[PDB]
Design a protein around this nucleic acid. Sequence first.
RNA 1: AGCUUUACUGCAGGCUGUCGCUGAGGACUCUCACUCCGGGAGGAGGACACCGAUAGCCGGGC
RNA 2: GACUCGUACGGUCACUGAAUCCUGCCCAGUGCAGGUAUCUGAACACCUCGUACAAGAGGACGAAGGACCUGUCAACGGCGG
RNA 3: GAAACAUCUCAGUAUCGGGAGGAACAGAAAACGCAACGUGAUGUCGUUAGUAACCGCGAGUGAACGCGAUACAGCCCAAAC
Lengths: 92, 56, 194, 237
Amino acid sequence: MQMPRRFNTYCPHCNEHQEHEVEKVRSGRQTGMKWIDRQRERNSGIGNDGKFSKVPGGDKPTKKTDLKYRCGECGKAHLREGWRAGRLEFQE
Amino acid sequence: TGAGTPSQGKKNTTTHTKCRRCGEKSYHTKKKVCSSCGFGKSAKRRDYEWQSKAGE
Amino acid sequence: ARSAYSYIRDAWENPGDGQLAELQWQRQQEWRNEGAVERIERPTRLDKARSQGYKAKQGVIVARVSVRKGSARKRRHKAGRRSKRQGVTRITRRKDIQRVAEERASRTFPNLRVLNSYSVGQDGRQKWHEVILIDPNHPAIQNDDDLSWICADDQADRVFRGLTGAGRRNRGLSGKGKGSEKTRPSLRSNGGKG
Amino acid sequence: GRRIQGQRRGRGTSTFRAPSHRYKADLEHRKVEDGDVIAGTVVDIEHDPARSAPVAAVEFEDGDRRLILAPEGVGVGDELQVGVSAEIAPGNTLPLAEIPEGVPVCNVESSPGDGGKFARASGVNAQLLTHDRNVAVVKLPSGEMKRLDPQCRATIGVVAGGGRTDKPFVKAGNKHHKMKARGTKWPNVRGVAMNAVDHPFGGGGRQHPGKPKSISRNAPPGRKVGDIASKRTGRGG
RNA sequence: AGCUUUACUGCAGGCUGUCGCUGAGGACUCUCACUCCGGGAGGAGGACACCGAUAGCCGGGC
RNA sequence: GACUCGUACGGUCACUGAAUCCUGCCCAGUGCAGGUAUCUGAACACCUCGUACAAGAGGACGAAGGACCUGUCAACGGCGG
RNA sequence: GAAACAUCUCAGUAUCGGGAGGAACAGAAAACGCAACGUGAUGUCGUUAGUAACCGCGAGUGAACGCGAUACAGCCCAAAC
Ligand SMILES: [Cl-]
Ligand SMILES: [Cl-]
Ligand SMILES: [Cl-]
Ligand SMILES: [Cl-]
Ligand SMILES: [K+]
Ligand SMILES: [Mg+2]
Ligand SMILES: [Mg+2]
Ligand SMILES: [Mg+2]
Ligand SMILES: [Mg+2]
Ligand SMILES: [Mg+2]
Ligand SMILES: [Mg+2]
Ligand SMILES: [Mg+2]
Ligand SMILES: [Mg+2]
Ligand SMILES: [Mg+2]
Ligand SMILES: [Mg+2]
Ligand SMILES: [Mg+2]
Ligand SMILES: [Mg+2]
Ligand SMILES: [Mg+2]
Ligand SMILES: [Mg+2]
Ligand SMILES: [Mg+2]
Ligand SMILES: [Mg+2]
Ligand SMILES: [Mg+2]
Ligand SMILES: [Mg+2]
Ligand code: NA
Ligand code: NA
Ligand code: NA
Ligand code: NA
Ligand code: NA
Ligand code: NA
Ligand code: NA
Ligand code: NA
Ligand code: NA
Ligand code: NA
């Protein structure tokens, strides 16, 4: 479906309607320093590594909407529930 | 030839004999080792923990 | 002023530099041709020996012992084993080479008792340690106020029961506080979890 | 499964061992301080159980009696020589350097003084080709060009017993008798005739190999069977 | 439970890089460790190989 | 340590199974082997960033191996609409 | 056992190798860290506590400091000269 790159809507920070911009959430990069990272190194040894021996799951026929809503004035963003959409393209 | 009765007839070989060390008829005169006390194999007497129940 | 000993000690802090370096490059050539256990008339590291209890006296013996370097020489499983227990290559023994050396020495001298041992280097495939042993039956030692303690019956086979210095360290008994919950007073009394 | 036959071999049990205690001599070139003054007389020609080829008993000037890898054309009475100055005739042994090029040699040494390693079977022979102060090139019976130290000793002439391979065994019994004098388990059961448990080619309702026969060089023992690291197979093209 | 394999997960083994042993003046010389041949003298090889450690590939041989 | 008191007319690993007449076509897949401009390819060391250090992120170089190319069926096998 | 199973669990159990004594082992802090102007070698018992901690964060696993007790005991070298 199509979607406006910008539009008026409630800003939970300002607590008043304002123009927000919509962006697709770009994945942040991992540091490899989180607790889970240390457990993988610590708990991996001879033979099977339990959970750390498992591999990536699969894919759902369609993914949900993963967007960021940025308040054009205060600059702060907020997240919303997403909805299944084969494709999402912005208008302007 | 049957492996039973007919094969029992050739058994006239002497192996296990009275042991000079423990007195049991377990000294294999061909191996020169006692299957019971270890004489001829070990200076120490043959003994294993599995010869009795684990907690005893 | 500095003792002469302090120089022997200071040289061995870097066995790969200086005269000591050339000395080793030479000795090890003869060493590699000697046997598993070689009794030697004088400690290669005097400061260390004396520091560990050595004494130019009757009943005090020293022998250099060579042990192979590396992990455990293990045989792969010949029956069912879960993946965890199917290893061979990465398994290492819980007793360090220096302890293996102290034991091989003590077996060579059945009447003697291990007093201590120290490292004297290694090449690419083996390590050498000099072990100091004591004749608990010689009166020269039975009458020595600094060593007669090793004459008591309860000191018999001390190396085989890990009562040696390298033994107690390898048993995780160094720390008297945190981290030694499963080591003191003994590995076995703690369920062997140390 | 169970270890394959190739694995039982290594254990060196009786079945796979050679009847060494029935062997005559570990044929090796004599050693000479130098000079070459060493010479001896052929006293007899015996059969060598380990090689199915004749061997020659020889008495040297210094009393030493020893069997030698006999080339063709050596008979009782003949006098052989061993040394840098040894004559250049059949039966004599001298370093490759003193040997004239283009001359058939046998029982060649790999490392000078090792006693002889190459070309020692029935009727074979090496071929000295190039000389030098450094390297002496020899063409081994396999057809390969072997660079060798000119100081490596070698015997002149082709090995005796040539043509042994020309006559067919005809019957199993004859093979049997020969096999019995070697370190070899015989007869041979085809892997494809065994059970899956016994060989990688075993199993099936009919006889055929499971996978392809050409196996990687890296294959582990127990699996390296069939055509080992074959660069090609068949006769075509 | 035995057996199979491009089932899942691993483990031996082979190959390969790297570190240690290991030294002198991306290709090269040398000798002194180390290896091998020689009864010895001495010869070949040589900082490689072997061995110890680690990494990638192959890996129903288990 | 066996093979081996052995050395290619050897011995190992496989297939077929006396003699006689013979043994066609196929290298795409799989296997093995050889080559390889380029692509891909780990760790140590090295460079950048980061941290008074460190974790960590990136880069450069690139072994075997793979991609790609070739050889090979008395190699696994195939020989139809 | 985890109602399969690979880490985990059974368990550092069974079993194996080596060895001491009448008891072994431990032991006079490079400790503790109720953080203190505090405690004061070591075992062990009661408790702390199924607490903290671990763990396909599943099933399960699991201390310590301290405290109350028992019994108490503190020393010898290496080096300097
Ligand atoms: Cl989206
Ligand atoms: Cl002892
Ligand atoms: Cl044959
Ligand atoms: Cl306190
Ligand atoms: K289990
Ligand atoms: Mg693992
Ligand atoms: Mg039966
Ligand atoms: Mg035989
Ligand atoms: Mg021989
Ligand atoms: Mg057959
Ligand atoms: Mg059958
Ligand atoms: Mg199989
Ligand atoms: Mg057939
Ligand atoms: Mg067939
Ligand atoms: Mg089953
Ligand atoms: Mg040798
Ligand atoms: Mg299986
Ligand atoms: Mg048939
Ligand atoms: Mg279960
Ligand atoms: Mg206790
Ligand atoms: Mg579950
Ligand atoms: Mg536990
Ligand atoms: Mg604590
Ligand atoms: Na851990
Ligand atoms: Na002893
Ligand atoms: Na532990
Ligand atoms: Na088959
Ligand atoms: Na079965
Ligand atoms: Na093909
Ligand atoms: Na092909
Ligand atoms: Na169950
Ligand atoms: Na089950
Ligand atoms: Na777990």
